[PDB]
Amino acid sequence: MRSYRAQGPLPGFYHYYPGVPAVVGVRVEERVNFCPAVWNTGLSADPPLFGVSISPKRFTHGLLLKARRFSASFHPFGQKDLVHWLGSHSGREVDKGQAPHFLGHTGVPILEGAYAAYELELLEVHTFGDHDLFVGRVVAVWEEEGLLDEKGRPKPGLALLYYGKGLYGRPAEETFAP
């Protein structure tokens, strides 16, 4: 086990990967945008809070501040090319609203093909270093029945995993319940 003192940004900050990327959908007037966020996480069960950490550099950043509502959608391995594409181009240069999607009960756009998605109302934004954490309260839930097991989890092997710097994967079929 090699070790070193941190002296600035790490030569790679990928030790806690892979993670599932959340597709953040935001609408301001007629303009819709999508942005994968691999820095995401549950923050509370009661009430249900979910967090995404978005750089001020993203076009999505300014949209979320304005809209104060967004979606977070979770997508099968099969949609990795679409997910990658949405994370390698900016709403500033291309209209991501053309990606097939529907609007939710609260009118946040949700990218199609998702096994599950949340609609969120923005509760708080906190700056931590060079990204902002958007804390959302889950106000509605979407699920694709025959892609989710009983307790709410996606069928093993289904989840798109992200390893960092453009590399994707998926979980194995084999699960262990000790």
Ligand X SMILES: Cc1cc2nc3c(=O)[nH]c(=O)nc-3n(C[C@H](O)[C@H](O)[C@H](O)COP(=O)(O)O)c2cc1C
List contacts with ligand Oc1ccc(O)cc1 (CB under 6 A): 38-39, 55, 164
Residue in 17, 39, 77, 142 binding ligand X, rule: CB under 6 A = 39
Closer of 81 and 145 to ligand X (Cβ): 81
Torsion angles phi and psi, residue 96, rounded to 5: -75, -15
Rounded least distance, CB 55 to ligand Oc1ccc(O)cc1, Å: 5
Rounded least distance, CB 172 to ligand X, Å: 17
Q: Which of residues 135-174 bind its own copies (CB under 8 A)?
A: 135, 137-145, 148, 151-154, 156-157, 159, 161, 163-174
Q: What are the residues facing 120 on neighbouring strands?
A: 70, 138
Closer of 7 and 175 to ligand X (Cβ): 175
Does 89 sit near ligand X (CB under 6 A)? yes
Does 22 sit near its own copies (CB under 8 A)? yes
Consecutive H or E run containing 167: strand 167-169
Q: Which of residues 112-131 bind ligand X (CB under 6 A)?
A: 131
Does 75 sit near ligand X (CB under 6 A)? no
Q: Which of residues 77-106 bind its own copies (CB under 8 A)?
A: 80-81, 84, 104-105
- For residue 81, the SS3 value is helix
Rounded least distance, CB 126 to its own copies, Å: 6
Torsion angles phi and psi, residue 130, rounded to 5: -95, 15
Closest by CA to 33, choosing from 76, 74, 62, is 62
Distances (CA, A) of 36 to 23, 31, 74, 91, 176: 4, 17, 10, 12, 29
Q: What span, in angstroms and rounded, lies between the C-alpha atoms of 19 and 76?
A: 13
Consecutive H or E run containing 63: helix 59-67
Total of residues contacting its own copies (CB under 8 A): 89
DSSP structure string for 126-149:
EEETTEEEEEEEEEEEEE-GGGB-
Binding-site positions for FMN: 33, 35-36, 38-39, 53, 55, 58-60, 86, 89-91, 96, 131
